[PDB]
């Protein structure tokens, strides 16, 4: 971000810096393919990267604003965040896991899968298909 552009149009907030990474950096040669995008922005990729950065809170906020419909997950994100990040509810974690296996596991947008898998610790057999790009 600290190098030309726009200089990004908006304020230097962390969120925008990541939007820049996702948009300017190599998610697009000349933009496209299989993300879920609203208003020109891959939300799931954003949450994933923000999470990658360590900005969990911001990632949570993005989800809140998201316009999405897996919303139960939204709940499970927030408490994961609230606690020590080992979100352990004696309650639902089990429920989240079932949904992952049935709905999410066989399908979806790579980043969405990443967020579910990583936050949830959903499927211990380990690896994320499309978006592991670095060692």
């Amino acid at each position: 971000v600290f190098g030309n552009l726009h200089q990004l149009g908006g304020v230097p907030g962390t969120y925008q810096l990541v939007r820049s990474f996702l948009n300017i950096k190599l998610p697009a040669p000349l933009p496209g393919l299989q993300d879920g995008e609203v208003e020109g922005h891959p939300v799931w990729a954003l949450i994933y990267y923000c999470m990658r950065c360590g900005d969990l809170l911001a990632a949570s906020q993005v989800v809140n604003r998201a316009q999405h419909q897996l919303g139960e997950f939204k709940t499970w994100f927030q408490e994961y965040m609230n606690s020590k990040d080992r979100r352990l509810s004696p309650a639902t974690e089990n429920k989240l896991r079932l949904h992952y296996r049935r709905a999410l596991r066989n399908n979806t947008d790579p980043y969405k899968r990443a967020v579910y898998c990583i936050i949830g610790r959903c499927d211990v057999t380990d690896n994320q298909s499309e978006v592991a790009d670095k060692t």
Binding site: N23, I24, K25, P29, L30, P31, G32, L33, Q34, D35
Partner: protein
């Protein structure tokens, strides 16, 4: 000719997707006068060099997203 028109239109289909306007404003230089008075037929019976430069900018810059970008690179390779 029909194929050529297809190609030009295809590029435009690409451009419509996004952030075309910003690049255009920044890019245009002395050549610009020639560019602005370019007709569709001019594209139909192409003015190759300018488009190549522009397309390169589309790819170099972030504007093209995903699959689109791959397509131009293919295009530059094929007919450029």
């Amino acid at each position: 000719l029909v194929r050529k028109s297809y190609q030009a239109l295809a590029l435009w289909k690409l451009l419509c997707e996004h952030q075309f306007t910003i690049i255009v404003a920044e890019l245009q230089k002395e050549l610009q006068e020639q560019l602005k008075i370019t007709t569709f037929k001019d594209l139909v019976i192409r003015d190759k060099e300018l488009t190549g430069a522009l397309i390169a900018s589309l790819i170099n810059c972030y504007i093209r997203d995903n699959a689109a970008v791959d397509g131009i690179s293919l295009h530059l390779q094929d007919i450029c």
